[PDB]
Write a protein that binds this ligand. Structure first.
Ligand SMILES: [Ca+2]
Ligand SMILES: [Ca+2]
Ligand SMILES: [Ca+2]
Ligand SMILES: [Ca+2]
Ligand SMILES: [Ca+2]
Ligand SMILES: [Ca+2]
Ligand SMILES: [Ca+2]
Ligand SMILES: [Ca+2]
Ligand SMILES: [Ca+2]
Ligand SMILES: [Fe+3]
Ligand SMILES: [Fe+3]
Ligand SMILES: [Fe+3]
Ligand SMILES: [Fe+3]
Ligand SMILES: [Fe+3]
Ligand SMILES: [Fe+3]
Ligand SMILES: [Fe+3]
Ligand SMILES: [Fe+3]
Ligand SMILES: [Fe+3]
Ligand SMILES: [Fe+3]
Ligand SMILES: [Fe+3]
Ligand SMILES: [Fe+3]
Ligand SMILES: [Fe+3]
Ligand SMILES: [Fe+3]
Ligand SMILES: [Fe+3]
Ligand SMILES: [Fe+3]
Lengths: 64, 68, 64, 64, 68, 64, 65, 62, 65, 64
């Protein structure tokens, strides 16, 4: 029994964990192309975080 | 192998899932006072999410740059 | 199937795990401000544990 | 890395989930004496939760 | 999906799990009274396991036929 | 960290869930050969349960 | 190693796309629906990038690719 | 989920069970506990032979 | 884990994979997607044959049945 | 609510994890015979990944 706000919260949480993974893998790699690739993915995931927080702000009354 | 920003992100993810749970339990509950209790816990968790987002934007430059 | 008492027990169990996580993160944190923020979150979660225990005792005359 | 209070919190969370399971199994049971056995287990588990809560209040200054 | 015997098997499996956790926590804990508390809990779940085995043998005749 | 009695307890819990699976599959099947195969397996698993409880009673004085 | 990490990220992105599209389908607000569709399109771009990386670092994968 | 799938599931669980029994036998300090785990491992390998037989008799593609 | 335990884990995973492929073939609506999943199931059955051969070769106790 | 494309994506994700497992086992194993076995398994799984990716591109407009 999820609603729209709950699904957005779930996507935001998943995105935050994904950023953790991207940064971990960038640190764990020593090939600079792989490192750069993971850093790029992490930055774009951070854009997704911003977008989901902004959606959450529009929809959720208790947050905004 | 985990730093402060990763820990903040994990706190935030857990808090968001907690809010989902609290709101679902408030909707599901029949006792008005149980409902009010879950509503209170959900509102407090939203306050903590606001604080955690502020911390994350303080510690994660690129996150802040995306206008988090 | 869940009733109110079951949902309160689940909330209490999740709160207890949450406190564990916050205290572990505070112990692991290198930044004193981050440590203080986690300690903050843990103290307020403990307040909610007390409330959830009271509520459980109110609904389950077996105490729990 | 866990400390004593953290172990107590984990045992408390587990016990609460166990109570949920015992009460659900009592409900779902068609044999009334299997029902009775599950209710007896739930009551003994509630007694454990009482003790763990008290221990946690004694060792945790925050009085969760 | 489950009958009474299956729920009893699940309860016994969970109890065995739980004793493992209690005894490990006793071994690991630093305060002698915390460690005694966990030992007492282990002893009480062991009594529960005895009761559950008796219930299981009573309701599962083939299990009883193999003994314990 | 586990000791010998904990490993025996884990194998016992796993066997009990295995019997649950076997009996459920014997019910779910309509082909008599497959039914009987699953019932034979559940019987042999019940033997393993007896043996493990016997080892546990030997090695755990609080269980015996 | 690095190739295993790329494979794990690709699998996670594929599951994420599935989530975004399921949430789009279940959304009641059409603006939320559109948001999940937008996320799905961006994650699909991430999948293309990861497949490219994998094809570059795994000559055995580029063999059939 | 059909009969052949239930048999594949039983066979997979049995193989993982054998692995567990042998790992526990290797990890165990009491030799009688070690031998008990090796006994369970051998019996479970018998179960694997039986499940493979059943799977081949029901799955012509296998 | 030793080599025989790794063979066993691979074989268990392959059997579960065949289950997933067959379930998805049953659930899918596009005929070519159904045929794709059926084809993957057939080739995984071949891998299972190889795994059991390898298991018997390396486990005398299993080979004795 | 899985559709055809979602099932394709899950099969691809599983195949990729499987390739990871095969290469890890090939590394960790002692016998060169089992090494070669796991290598051959990895290679055919990579063929499957290629097939899955083509199916995905074809069902999913948004993929490239
Ligand atoms: Ca994500
Ligand atoms: Ca919580
Ligand atoms: Ca318990
Ligand atoms: Ca228990
Ligand atoms: Ca078993
Ligand atoms: Ca992702
Ligand atoms: Ca088994
Ligand atoms: Ca496989
Ligand atoms: Ca696979
Ligand atoms: Fe994303
Ligand atoms: Fe991504
Ligand atoms: Fe964007
Ligand atoms: Fe919190
Ligand atoms: Fe606050
Ligand atoms: Fe709370
Ligand atoms: Fe207990
Ligand atoms: Fe119990
Ligand atoms: Fe006690
Ligand atoms: Fe047997
Ligand atoms: Fe067994
Ligand atoms: Fe025997
Ligand atoms: Fe078995
Ligand atoms: Fe295959
Ligand atoms: Fe495959
Ligand atoms: Fe394979």
């Amino acid at each position: 029994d999820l609603d729209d706000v709950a699904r957005i919260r779930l996507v935001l949480a998943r995105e935050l964990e994904t950023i953790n993974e991207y940064e971990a893998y960038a640190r764990a790699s020593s090939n600079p192309e792989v490192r750069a690739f993971f850093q790029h993915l992490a930055a774009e995931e951070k854009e997704h975080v911003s977008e989901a927080v902004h959606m959450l702000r529009m929809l959720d009354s208790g947050q905004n």
